[PDB]
């Protein structure tokens, strides 16, 4: 479990962030609570500001939605930095533009995250 941690992309250095409309992206660190995330212990990754759950689909889109208990909202954190969706098996990824998505694991640094 974790409370109010940042989730930083190892490659870009940008932080996972989201808004009340459910958009997810990365931005440079700004100290705000939209850039913090909380993991209760049920596999969810909840935005500390909005309370919405990180979610994704088989096409690789990522977004936040009200927490609904489903497997698309459950994530596995690996000690090597992967963040894997339980339903799809795809891992969280992002780019220098700030887009966030999921892709099959390919060992790249864009799929490594530092959570703390
Ligand atoms: Na973050
Ligand atoms: Na979640
Ligand atoms: Na990942």
Give the CATH number for residue 110: 2.80.10.50
List the domain range (segments joined by +) for residue 89.
1-116
**SS3 sequence, the chain?**
CEEEECEEECCCCCEEEECCCCCEEEECCCCCHHHCEEECCCCCCEECCCCCEEEECCCCEEEEECCCCCHHHCEEECCCCCEEECCCCCEEEECCCCCEEEECCCCCHHHCEEEC
Ligand having the closest approach to the CA of 115: 1
Resolution in A: 1.2
Q: How far is the CA of 9 from the centre of ligand 1 (A)?
A: 9
Cβ partners under 8 Å of residue 96, min gap 6: 12, 14
Q: How far is the CA of 35 from the centre of ligand 2 (A)?
A: 14
Distance between CA atoms of 83 and 13, rounded to whole angstroms? 16
Strand order in the sheet with 100-103: 75-77, 83-85, 91-94, 100-103
Number of folded domains that form the chain:
1
37 DSSP β-pair partners: 5, 47
């Amino acid at each position: 479990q974790f409370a109010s941690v940042t989730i930083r992309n190892a490659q870009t250095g940008r932080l996972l962030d989201s808004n009340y409309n459910g958009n997810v992206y990365t931005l440079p660190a700004n100290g705000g609570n939209y850039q913090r995330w909380t993991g209760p212990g049920d596999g969810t990754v909840r935005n500390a500001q909005t309370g919405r759950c990180l979610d994704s689909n088989y096409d690789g889109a990522v977004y936040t939605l009200p927490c609904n208990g489903g497997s698309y909202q459950k994530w596995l954190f690996y000690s090597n930095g992967y963040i894997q969706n339980v339903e799809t098996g795809r891992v969280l990824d992002s780019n220098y533009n700030g887009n966030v998505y999921t892709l099959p694991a390919n060992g790249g640094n864009y799929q490594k995250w530092y959570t703390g």
